[model samples]
Target: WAESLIGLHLGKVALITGGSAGIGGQIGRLLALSGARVMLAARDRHKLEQMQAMIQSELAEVGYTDVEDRVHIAPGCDVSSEAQLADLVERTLSAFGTVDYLINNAGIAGVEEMVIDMPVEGWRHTLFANLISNYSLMRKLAPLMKKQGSGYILNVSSYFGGEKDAAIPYPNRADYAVSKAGQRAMAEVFARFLGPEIQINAIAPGPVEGDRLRGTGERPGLFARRARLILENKRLNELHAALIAAARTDERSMHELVELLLPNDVAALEQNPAAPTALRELARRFRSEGDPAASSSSALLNRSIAAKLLARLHNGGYVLPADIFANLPNPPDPFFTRAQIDREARKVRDGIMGMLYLQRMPTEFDVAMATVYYLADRNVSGETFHPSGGLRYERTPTGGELFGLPSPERLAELVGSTVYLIGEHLTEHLNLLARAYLERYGARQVVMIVETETGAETMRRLLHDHVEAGRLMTIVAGDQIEAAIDQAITRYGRPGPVVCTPFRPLPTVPLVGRKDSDWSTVLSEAEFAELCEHQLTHHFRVARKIALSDGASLALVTPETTATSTTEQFALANFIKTTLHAFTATIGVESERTAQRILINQVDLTRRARAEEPRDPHERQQELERFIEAVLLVTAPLPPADTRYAGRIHRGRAITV
Candidate 1:
């Protein structure tokens, strides 16, 4: 596992404290072998040299000629002191221009004493060495990482001091417990503060058989009881992979991409030919019965055979569906017998083939890899993923275990229905639309269409608080809109209503530093052409799909200013808004059934508070609140077709206080 990360950290620099022995020493060795310029810090110069020699010998054994050249040692420094740590940083940077990974694994076990008998000095010493040491290093390294725009910090913590471990009895370990808890708390704080840029995470190990606990191995029961807390050396090396994944992952959470990983497990099943073969046989046998009204015994026998086939696959690490017919073409409704099977035998066979690709079991390694990959790919921020051995006790399941396939509820909701909202800023309005889609249609993901990179960023921040990390996906709408839309549909199968909003009205003012004095009254040829292309190719193309596309609904939104009078200066804005409405309405008539599902409206933000000046702060707040409420009432559930103005344009205004 450590060797796998060589490419990622080949030229990187890592500073690991407590590097003389135990897990820290092991990590240092792995990192050195993986081509990282490693700096190991410890209190004893002798042991530190011994560790260096050990790593050197291991490298030599593997046929690497240079050892001392790659690994360095910084001994005789007590981590408890901030001054010493600062000097260590200076030496590291002097050696390597920038520090890439800061591994906080230093600290002593400290003297264990009963709470009543423990000296105050002992508690203070533990805090200084364990908790403060980690905090001080992060304080110094965070700014450097911020300047570099990327870094990964891994803090070693203890599970015994966590919330779940609070119930574990430790007669004389109060100081150690308190310090470890503080270290973890500090890690979480930094993860949130320095995150979406620099990734900070803490790994809390349970009772592990390190050098200090090796002697206790003679007692089997005691060892097994404690060993229950122990994680193997090879398993811990998985952390290097996790760190690599975290550093590369965009500031995003992995929760959004869990479902994507499910299909991979099915691919795993595909690799095992026996599983697919058995499924096909079962499908053929069940369909051969040829009776639409097969006997209960026959139905029961078919289900039993299907269960047996699934068991064979499950034994080989393929999925176990809660319902036997979950992958079959026939609905479980009316408990369909042989006729549905015969009618849709090929579909049932294909569904079974699909089932073979699902995951049978999930492990910590799989979970960590998937989480890191997904989180990084999405660019999610402020999330720290540790295996159960670290912060979370229970083993987390991979996407396959949680969801063998897409939920039936989600599939039923995709009926191609579209719900659209339009506004310059619809963060709050978007949130309501998402919740409504989720509640009414069981839709979990929403694909947002925007015009530019700036528009995408604005939507991300505006909807950040309203939507969950991975739920809101923004796509740049231009020449790529159609392909992008198709990609979204494929990626998130059964995506709910499409929410379409035009970019804020284009600026009607003249360019400040134009070289031409006569440019005031007219747009440049380039600008005019771009505007026409955007409307015809992008906006019209998308609107046509939503309107004419099978069962989908369209909710069109524009600004109230479009309805009111405007100066000649706003000609471009007026033309675009008017064309948008007329084109959508015309298409509404062209696509018969879809015409009933169309909704058109506009939002008025003129009365909303401005940073420049609030004409009436209280009045602006009231108008903003009322407008948002009205948007929610109209956009969500999309005002039924039988209601007045359902298929026509309804200009929504912000009512004043």
Candidate 2:
């Protein structure tokens, strides 16, 4: 999203397509945030800094003692400048004689259309942006790497780059998927052709969650904006976080950090002490029009995020509004209008909730971790790494795999070996949803978990299977579970789209006047269970297990609102909602290799008292059906790029009881 070229190195967001500039560096690296740029479009300045801290710290923890980025890439315009390769290499060799990791993170956006409708120019442009630039970088660097004898090349391929045929066809992005996949395919060719010690591998990321890229491209809207807004914000904070951390060591180090940020301005800084208003002048030109001939200080500091980052750095961890957008020459511009961003963001969010099993796309950090994992281990090569949970969309072709799944080629033969599970709390919305899972998985054993005594009695027969064999397991917790399904497959075939169950009375909780009990309690129960057992901890258990069976729509479910209530006792409900909202997000990246997704979607059932009244014959039944329908849609295996609706709102009807 932003590029901070400190010294000769960039702050990882640089998207230098191979050009003459490529000849100026040691084929050092090509860092860009195609996914982060998209995610940044929806975030604020504070959110920007937060993301930086998260990634940098993770990199630090990932065994890199100090992640002080020391590699650099040239400009996007330099994609065609390989003729200067020898000159660039001479300079690099003259300085250090060794290059750091050559992470190929270059590329422009893909054409989001079907193969038939895809424009030739658009498709080729995508092919060139995602494929050629990367290929060119490696080609130019190959001789140097072969000379070095040891090298590691990583390509940031995408989840859209289907390793094989998608179970559900990847719609609306024929050009994108292929080009992204081509990046992966190219890694293999290089891996085999290059010396074995060179370590060539590709990381196929799902729709990553971060700032949108700010790469230069032929078309205006074809890729991220050239005038990177949030990306700048990130780099500025990165400078400050590094500055402050450096400041903790000593002022001499801080000065070097500042000098690094302002590459060509170090000559007389230690001599010319007081240039009081230079800061104001620098801030002004940065927000307005910038000068190509200006010192690196102005070129880097002339933007809004950078200024705010400087302001925060100058202050003691606090920032004021006057230091930010107030004094800028003009307001900044984003890739698209705010209206357009929100509209399209909604479309993808809804589509994601319904189609992809990993409810949301993998984040920039998630995809980055895939690269990290590959580097940390020596066990992988020429193999594909999918950071999308069960995202392969590997469904077996049944009449309906899970009530109408795809051709079973992906996981056709592998269907019934594993076990499928339902959560502890049993509701009409949940149990019927289980029918869908059962039909698709047809597991050898099924675990039916519930929080109520009535859970076991409620199921008279399996919705799509036979109750030939079953067992009950009671954990330390009071909740109990029993399965009505024996080792039955989908003999009745996928269940009807509409599943209606006989109405049952809602359980009444007798509030003991802010009660006390020997056993624990809902929110408090959920405090431990909602967040721990049901959501966060539950995810932990699955994360531990799924590494063995492969993964699937790696998603977790929650109420539409992580909500609010005036009743003081229900605080933990909101606690879990918001906590799990992040729980879903953090774990998505935490288990990036698992490709699990997290989303907090609104189920759209309001307090019209559905149990008390009715709008249609199957009022509650339809409500349950809608809930199940949305679940089926969410858990269905599909591409992460599908953005057909808005933020996690699954509503075919606005059923307000």
Candidate 3:
């Protein structure tokens, strides 16, 4: 039986071309059996009608009367002809009301001849039938699919036109190779265009023992047997199931996918299993037993191990097995370590072998199959997923690593009488941090130290989602950063931990002096003065305020400025960062506030956002989360006792991530 783990396509409609015979017919039958109303199209009216009857009879035998009358046929429909194909689509809609899946499998095999010797007419005919036909259908069908907001298009391809053949052509099949290659390319182009809603993919099947290859005396001995086993219709049908699942379910994209081998056949040594050994072993045992719950002891132990380990792994949490501790020279922090797992694994050895028991290694075929279905998933858009020993997909980096920050809990504790966040705008990171702080501690007022009124307005609108009206405040630091602080205090009261998120200034544009110099090409004299004043005010005003009051502050700076050339202007900008950092540190140590601690630290985002700025909403939000975590680390609790260095100054130090 096929896996229905993600639910079956109970009310979906599919249109399969070349549905009279071979894999096309098989796919239509399987999808129809899976409760989808299917439309079968072929050039031969008699054969198409016959295949439809067979599929209907099969459904009726299985008590699928609901889908028995759902199988329709579009006879005498050649895909290369736009008129017939359009009529086919019209008939499909008239019969089924909507088309959710389009299996573009209609094509003719090219003549077996070298490209140099092949006739121009034969080449043109093959390309038109196999390559251009798919595009013709896509043009007419794409709008309909986009309107529905969900659709799956499977372009049946072959390995002859794949990457491996780029260097070496498939012998005596030049026309076929080019045609299939074209189909593969089109899949990627359309997949990107229709993604997050509609997914387009190509299935590049290997040499299958289908109608075309049945009579060919290709090879003998082991090669023949191996080819026979690999080319069996059962395996091919399995691949079809994956495509059907991809189309029927809302998961997969333009992926040139193939299944060369099965999971069981691939040696365990060849695969690098990424899942924890204990969890893998447990999953294996669960699958082995007919009734896993019948053995109460084993089931209970399985549940326990799954609960503790799988839960952590899925949430982006790390879990080192018991063996990892043995390898370490020094013991890890006891709070986060789990030595008890080894003992638990031992107690349940009889039930499912030990946690070290080698689970059945997935064959290459299994991985390829899984990869095909995985690519069908919409979440994995714009990524290539090949069969691997470990997880097939490359997961995004962690929040801690991505944002160069500490945990959120730590930053929340750093909030004081005054909190200053100096940055470009209320970015996703700022928004997330503000929200986190508000959620952890009750509502508190925050002030944005901005240079321009436009920047101030942007902050208000961007942060509107996170902080309520009166609680979120902004002060324009034109020439007097200290005055801005006074205005903020007058309206919003004494500040807490001030967070600064700074942007890399354009080096050619001066920051503390007149800009009309011959070397200053980017900024005007007045613009240069404004730039210098804004930065100085942010650094001086905030530092001076912390020195005067018992409050603490943080400056968010990117120490590495690889975005521009390292001219004399670059040196000056860095000097500003260095001076501010040193001044803030001295104040933190020299402050006489005995009740509260003060800190002057740099929120270092390592090399993040240096190469590229986040334009995607998901990525920007993720970056935001990481920044907030970094803020937490900077704001972590300090020593309660009044010591000489109680007010610490940490520079060039931030979260590991």
Off by over 4 Å in 1: 1-5, 60-65, 163-171, 213-657
User: Could you tell me how far off, in angstroms, the CA of residue 315 lies in candidate 3 after the best superposition?
Assistant: 66
Comparing 1 and 2 by lDDT, which wins? 1
Best by lDDT: 3
TM-score, predicted candidate 1 vs. hidden true structure: 0.36
Put the candidates in lDDT order, highest first: 3, 1, 2
Q: Is 2 or 3 the stronger prediction by TM-score?
A: 3
TM-score of each: 0.36, 0.32, 0.36
Candidate 1: deviation at residue 428, Å? 38
* lDDT values, one for every candidate: 0.46, 0.36, 0.49
Per-structure clash totals for the candidates = 16, 48, 34
Q: Pairing residues by index, what is the TM-score of model 3?
A: 0.36
Per-residue error (Å), model 2, residue 265: 66
Write the residue-wise lDDT of candidate 1 on 1-657 in tens digits. Answer: 535544445776888898877667766777776667789998899999999999888777766677777778888878877678888888878777677778887867664432222334565566667766775676566667767677777766655444311212222354565455555544543354466567766665443334534211111123222321221111121211222133223333222222122332223332434333422233343345434454321232223333433332232122235463444322233344444434454442343233322313223234323322332232433233333332222221100111122234423544434333322344555555555554555455566666567766777776675345666666665445545555544454422244454454454543111222333344442444344344322444454343222213444443323223234223443334422332332333323222224332322232212232234668556544554444443343332234445433221111111
Per-residue CA lDDT of model 3 for 240-284, tens digit only, reads: 223222322222220211111112211231232642333234335
* Superposed Cα deviation of residue 583, candidate 2 (Å): 36
